[PDB]
Design a protein around this ligand. Structure first.
Ligand SMILES: [Cl-]
Ligand SMILES: [Cl-]
Ligand SMILES: [Mg+2]
Ligand SMILES: [Mg+2]
Ligand SMILES: [Mg+2]
Ligand SMILES: [Mg+2]
Ligand SMILES: [Mg+2]
Ligand SMILES: [Mg+2]
Ligand SMILES: [Mg+2]
Ligand SMILES: [Mg+2]
Ligand SMILES: [Mg+2]
Ligand code: NA
Ligand code: NA
Ligand code: NA
Ligand code: NA
Ligand code: NA
Ligand code: NA
Lengths: 186, 95, 156, 154, 140
RNA sequence: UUAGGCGGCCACAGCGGUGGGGUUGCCUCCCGUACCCAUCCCGAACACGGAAGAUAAGCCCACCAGCGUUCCGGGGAGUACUGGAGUGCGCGAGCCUCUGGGAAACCCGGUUCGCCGCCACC
RNA sequence: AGUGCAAGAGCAAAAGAUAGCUUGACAGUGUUCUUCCCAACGAGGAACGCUGACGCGAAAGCGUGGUCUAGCGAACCAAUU
RNA sequence: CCUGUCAAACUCCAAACUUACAGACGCCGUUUGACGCGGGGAUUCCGGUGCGCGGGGUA
C-alpha cells in the first residue's frame, strides 16, 4: 500500500475470516475438519478435507435445508444447530467419513454454544470427534426448552406467526427421530 | 569466521524479503511426502521450528521415512552421506 | 604528506561513520559559489572533467576550488556567475603512523572518489569565459589530467 | 557439423577445459574430430574456443582429409573407398563424408577412430595467440577458412 | 436511505483522572453503575513511577444509562464547536465524553469480518452538532 | 456464486474513489436480554432469542489508475559488470580486442482496481 | 514498540501486552545434526522421536526452560541419590 | 518544491558466476571390474611463483 517494502496480510486475514494460527493447529491432526459456522438466521456445518488447490467439502448441512425434512420453526437456534450437525454428520458417514476435529473458526468456545451443539449432533450421527462433554449444553436446552419456557413468560407470541404459540421442543424430537433412519440424501 | 556458531554468516539466507515477512501459509507446513521423493531444502525465515543446519540450505535430498511429524531426508554433504531431520515447512517437491 | 599515498582507489570503500571515529573536518569552504541566489539561467556552462578515476583529498579540493574561484574575481566579488564543486570527500583515509604489527592505520583525513569522465566542477557564465582560465588553474592542483568542457555554448 | 582441431598444448590449460577436449576425443595437438552441432556440443566447443580451431568444412575437404587421415578403430588399415565400402554403410568416402556432414552418423558408428590425426600445417598457421577476426588461427572459422587449415594439414 | 444514517449515542465515558480512589463512589452515583480502575503506563516524576496502579476510574454508559445521564450532564455544560471531534465526538467538563456514530457501527466492533467504517458513512462534526443540538440545548 | 461457507496462490489481490443491488429468498446492519454465556464497568464486544424496519455501512455486482504493486513494448543498453583467451595498448592506475553471458536507475506507452479450487444455492 | 544482555535474524487475531492458572526448567531412553563443511576426534550444544508421569485448552494442540545463534569442563578422589 | 553527493559492517533492485538434484549427449566401466567396501605400508603437516579476486600496509 505505502511502498515496495509494505507488507499486505494474506487475503483471508484482511477479510478477517480465517485465523491461520488456529488453522495450522487444526490441520495438525491430519483429520477432516468439522467446520461449524453461524449466520443471524442460519447455521452451517461442513466436513472439509485438504486439497491441492484449496479445501474440499465432502459433506455439509445447512439449517435451511432442514425444513426439507419437516422443519417448520426458526433456524437460528440451539435445536436448529444440533440437527444441522446431525444431518451433516449423517451425510458425512455416507461419504465414508469417520472422524473429524471441530473447527469453530472465529467463534468463541463458550459452554453450551451452538457450535458445540453442532458438534454434539455430528458426534451422534456417528462421527468420531475429539470433544469434552461438559462444555456442551444439557440436552434440554438443545431440545429448545430454554425457548419454550421463555414463551411461558408470554403475553405476546415469541414467534411472529410462525408455528405454534408455546413453541415445541417436541418438534425437535420428531425431527431428530426422523433423521435417525432411511430418508433421502442421508 | 570470527566465531563458529550455526548462524555464522547466515544474515542473508535466514532473512526474508520485506514482503514475504510475517507468518507463513500453513499449506506447506502440512504437505506430506513419500519415501523416495526428492525434496529441496530451504529454511523458511518465518518458521522457527523443524529447521536444519543452515549449511544445508540449497540441498536436494531424498525423503526416507520420518520421525514424529518431521521428515528424515538423506543428502550427501560433499562426499559424505548425512540424514537431515526437517519439517515440511522447510521442504519443497522437486520438479 | 604526498598524494602518492592516497590518490589510488585500490582500497575498499571506507565511509561508515557509525564504525569510524575521529575523522578530521573537511577543509573545503563552500560548494556553491558566486550568485547562488540565482539558478543556472546562463548562456554558457563549462565543466572541469576528471580524466582518470582517482581519490582527491579534501586538501586538493580546497586548493583547487580556491585557486579557481579566488581567480574568478576577474569578474568581481559579486560578479554574475555561479560555481559548483559537485563532489564531497566521503572516503576516510588512514595512515600507519610497532612496525607492521597491528598496522591498521588511524584516521588522518578524507578524500573524494572521482571516476574518469565525471565533472568535478561546473561553472555558469555569460559569454565571458574567464572561467576557462579559473580551471586551467584548478586542474593544476588535483592529481589527474583534466578536460575543460563547454556544454551550452555554440557562441564560438 | 564442425571440424575441431586442437592448436594449443595441454600445459597450463585449465583442467576442466582439458577434460572437455578429451571428451571430444582429442588428446594431442593437431588432432581433429568431427562434432555435431547441438546445444550440448555447442557449449563444449565454446569452452574450448581458445585452444582450438573449428568450423564447418566443405564436402571436398572432408573427403580429402578422411582419405588422408582416417583410421579404423584399430590398426594401420588405410581408409580408402574400398575400405569404406567393405566396412561401412556407405559405398565410398564421399558417401561417408556426406553422412557425417549431414550428421546422420559418426566415425565411431562406422568403426572408425573418432580422431583424424592431422599433420602440422604446411606453410604454418596464423598463430595461436589471436583469434580469426584478428589474423590469428583460434576460434570459429569460415568454411573457406577451415578448409585452408584442414587442407594444409592434410 | 435515512433512519440508518441518522446519528445516535454510543457510550458516554465519565472518568476522573486523579493522580493516585475514593472518587469512584461519586461516579457510581452520578452514573448508576460500578466504576473501573485506571492503571497508568510509564514511570514519571509526579511520584507516579508505579506501572500497574490505580490512578482514576471511568464509566462507560450505553443506551438509557447514557441518556438519563446526559439529561443532566449536557445542561451543566455550555461549550460547543471547535471542542468537537472530527468524527462527531465531543468531551466536556471530571470528564464526560460522548461518542457518536451511525447505525452500522458494529461492523467495525465485531470479531468476524470486521471492517473499518467508510469515511462517507462516518459522522462529521457538523452532522453531529445538528443531532445533539436537536436534543434539548444549543450549539456554540 | 440476485448477495453464502471453507480455502489455495498471498498487493496482478494494497491505498483512494464512482455507480448499482435487495418486492418472497441470502449476507448484513437491525430488534431484544428469560435462558447457556459474558464485560477487572458497560447484552459495546462475546453469548443467546428473534424479525418491526433498512440497503445507509458491510457484503456482492459494474467501473476509475491518482498512489503502491505485477508483467510487457520501445528507449536507456548490448551500456555497467562479468566466466574464458591474448608476446593487444598503457610509466602506471588501468584499458582494449576476441569468445560466452548480461543489469540497475529513469523516461515514454500498455497491463494490473485479483486469479483459481471445493461445497452449497431460482 | 516490545521480546533480560552483543550483533545479526524471527515475531501482530503473536513469539509482544494484560489476566488467570500451572511447574514440561519432569524421569527414562534414543534418532540426527553440530562441535570437527568436505573428512577422523571428546566434553558441550541443538533439532526431532519414543516410554512414563503431568499442566493447560472445547479441541486440534502446545509444553524436551527463556524466539534463534554465547553463558562452558576429562580421568583419579570426595560428598550426595 | 528545486538543487549537490555516498556506503566493508545500507538495500526497492541485481548479474556474470558458484552450487544441490535429475534427465540428455559426451567420455568411461562391466577379461583393463569402474563406483564402492575392508585391510597393510607410507611420505607429509617451513612451501614458492604467475594470473584472477582479494584484506592490511606509503610501499
Ligand atoms: Cl461464523
Ligand atoms: Cl541439520
Ligand atoms: Mg554476504
Ligand atoms: Mg589405433
Ligand atoms: Mg618451413
Ligand atoms: Mg607464429
Ligand atoms: Mg448502496
Ligand atoms: Mg525454543
Ligand atoms: Mg588431579
Ligand atoms: Mg557433593
Ligand atoms: Mg562464491
Ligand atoms: Na513468511
Ligand atoms: Na609492540
Ligand atoms: Na593535474
Ligand atoms: Na485491578
Ligand atoms: Na449495503
Ligand atoms: Na556430542
Amino acid at each position: 500500500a505505502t511502498g515496495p517494502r509494505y507488507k499486505v496480510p494474506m487475503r483471508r486475514r484482511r477479510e478477517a475470516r480465517t485465523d491461520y494460527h488456529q488453522r495450522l493447529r487444526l490441520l495438525k491432526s491430519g483429520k477432516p475438519r468439522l467446520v461449524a459456522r453461524k449466520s443471524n438466521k442460519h447455521v452451517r456445518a461442513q466436513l472439509v478435507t485438504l486439497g491441492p488447490n484449496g479445501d474440499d467439502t465432502l459433506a455439509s448441512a445447512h439449517s435451511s435445508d432442514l425444513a426439507e425434512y419437516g422443519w417448520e420453526a426458526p433456524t437460528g437456534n440451539m435445536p436448529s444447530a444440533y440437527l444441522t450437525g446431525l444431518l451433516a454428520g449423517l451425510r458425512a458417514q455416507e461419504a465414508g467419513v469417520e472422524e473429524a476435529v471441530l473447527d469453530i473458526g472465529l467463534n468463541s468456545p463458550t459452554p453450551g454454544s451452538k457450535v458445540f451443539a453442532i458438534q454434539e449432533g455430528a458426534i451422534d450421527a456417528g462421527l468420531d470427534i475429539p470433544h469434552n462433554d461438559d462444555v456442551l449444553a444439557d440436552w434440554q436446552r438443545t431440545r429448545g426448552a430454554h425457548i419454550a419456557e421463555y414463551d411461558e413468560q408470554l403475553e405476546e407470541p415469541l414467534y411472529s406467526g410462525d408455528f405454534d404459540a408455546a413453541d415445541l421442543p417436541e418438534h425437535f424430537d420428531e425431527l431428530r427421530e426422523t433423521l435417525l433412519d432411511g430418508d433421502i440424501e442421508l | 569466521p570470527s566465531s563458529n556458531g550455526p548462524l555464522e554468516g547466515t544474515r542473508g539466507k535466514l532473512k526474508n524479503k520485506p514482503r514475504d515477512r510475517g507468518t507463513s501459509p500453513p499449506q506447506r507446513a502440512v504437505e506430506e511426502f513419500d519415501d523416495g521423493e526428492k525434496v529441496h531444502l530451504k529454511i523458511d525465515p518465518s518458521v522457527p521450528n523443524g529447521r536444519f543446519h543452515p549449511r544445508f540450505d540449497g540441498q536436494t535430498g531424498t525423503v526416507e521415512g520420518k520421525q514424529g511429524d518431521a521428515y528424515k531426508v538423506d543428502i550427501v554433504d560433499g562426499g559424505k552421506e548425512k540424514t537431515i531431520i526437517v519439517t515440511a515447512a522447510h521442504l519443497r517437491r522437486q520438479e | 604528506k604526498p598524494g602518492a599515498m592516497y590518490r589510488n582507489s585500490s582500497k575498499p570503500a571506507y565511509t561508515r561513520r557509525e564504525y569510524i571515529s575521529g575523522i578530521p573536518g573537511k577543509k573545503i569552504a563552500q560548494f556553491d559559489m558566486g550568485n547562488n541566489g540565482a539558478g543556472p539561467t546562463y548562456p554558457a556552462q563549462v565543466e572541469l572533467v576528471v580524466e582518470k578515476p582517482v581519490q582527491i583529498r579534501h586538501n586538493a579540493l580546497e586548493a583547487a576550488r580556491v585557486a579557481a574561484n579566488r581567480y574568478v574575481q576577474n569578474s568581481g566579488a559579486a560578479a554574475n556567475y555561479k560555481f559548483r564543486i559537485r563532489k564531497f570527500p566521503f572516503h576516510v583515509i588512514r595512515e600507519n603512523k610497532d612496525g607492521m604489527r597491528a598496522p591498521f592505520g588511524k584516521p588522518v583525513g578524507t578524500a573524494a572518489r572521482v571516476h574518469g569522465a565525471n565533472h568535478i566542477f561546473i561553472a555558469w557564465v555569460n559569454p565571458d569565459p574567464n572561467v576557462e582560465e579559473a580551471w586551467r588553474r584548478a586542474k593544476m592542483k588535483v592529481t589527474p589530467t583534466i578536460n575543460i568542457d563547454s556544454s551550452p555554448a555554440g557562441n564560438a | 557439423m564442425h571440424a575441431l582441431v586442437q592448436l594449443r598444448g595441454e600445459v597450463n590449460m585449465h583442467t576442466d577445459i582439458q577434460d572437455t577436449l578429451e571428451m571430444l576425443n582429442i588428446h594431442h595437438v593437431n588432432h581433429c574430430t568431427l562434432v555435431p552441432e547441438t546445444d550440448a556440443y555447442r557449449g563444449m566447443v565454446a569452452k574450448v574456443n581458445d585452444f582450438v580451431a573449428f568450423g564447418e568444412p566443405s564436402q571436398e575437404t572432408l573427403e580429402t582429409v578422411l582419405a588422408t587421415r582416417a583410421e579404423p578403430l584399430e590398426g594401420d588399415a588405410d581408409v580408402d573407398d574400398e575400405w569404406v565400402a567393405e566396412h561401412t554403410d556407405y559405398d565410398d568416402i564421399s558417401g561417408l563424408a556426406f553422412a557425417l556432414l549431414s550428421e546422420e552418423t559418426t566415425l565411431r558408428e562406422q568403426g572408425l577412430s573418432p580422431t583424424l590425426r592431422l599433420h602440422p600445417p604446411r606453410g604454418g598457421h596464423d598463430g595461436v595467440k589471436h583469434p580469426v577476426k584478428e589474423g590469428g588461427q583460434l576460434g570459429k572459422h569460415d568454411t573457406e577458412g577451415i578448409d585452408d587449415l584442414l587442407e594444409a594439414m592434410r | 436511505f435515512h433512519e440508518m444514517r441518522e446519528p445516535r449515542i454510543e457510550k458516554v465515558v465519565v472518568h476522573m483522572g486523579i493522580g493516585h480512589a475514593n472518587a469512584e463512589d461519586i461516579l457510581g452515583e452520578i452514573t448508576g453503575q460500578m466504576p473501573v480502575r485506571t492503571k497508568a503506563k510509564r514511570t514519571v516524576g509526579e511520584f507516579d513511577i508505579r506501572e500497574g496502579d490505580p490512578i482514576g476510574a471511568k464509566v462507560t454508559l450505553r443506551d438509557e444509562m447514557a441518556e438519563e445521564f446526559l439529561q443532566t450532564a449536557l445542561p451543566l455544560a455550555e461549550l460547543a464547536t471547535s471542542q468537537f471531534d472530527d468524527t462527531g465526538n465531543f468531551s466536556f467538563g471530571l470528564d464526560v465524553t460522548v461518542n457518536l456514530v451511525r447505525p452500522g457501527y458494529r461492523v467495525a466492533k465485531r470479531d468476524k469480518a470486521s471492517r473499518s467504517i467508510p469515511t462517507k458513512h462516518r459522522l462529521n462534526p457538523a452532522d453531529a452538532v445538528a443531532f445533539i443540538e436537536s436534543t434539548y440545548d444549543v450549539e456554540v
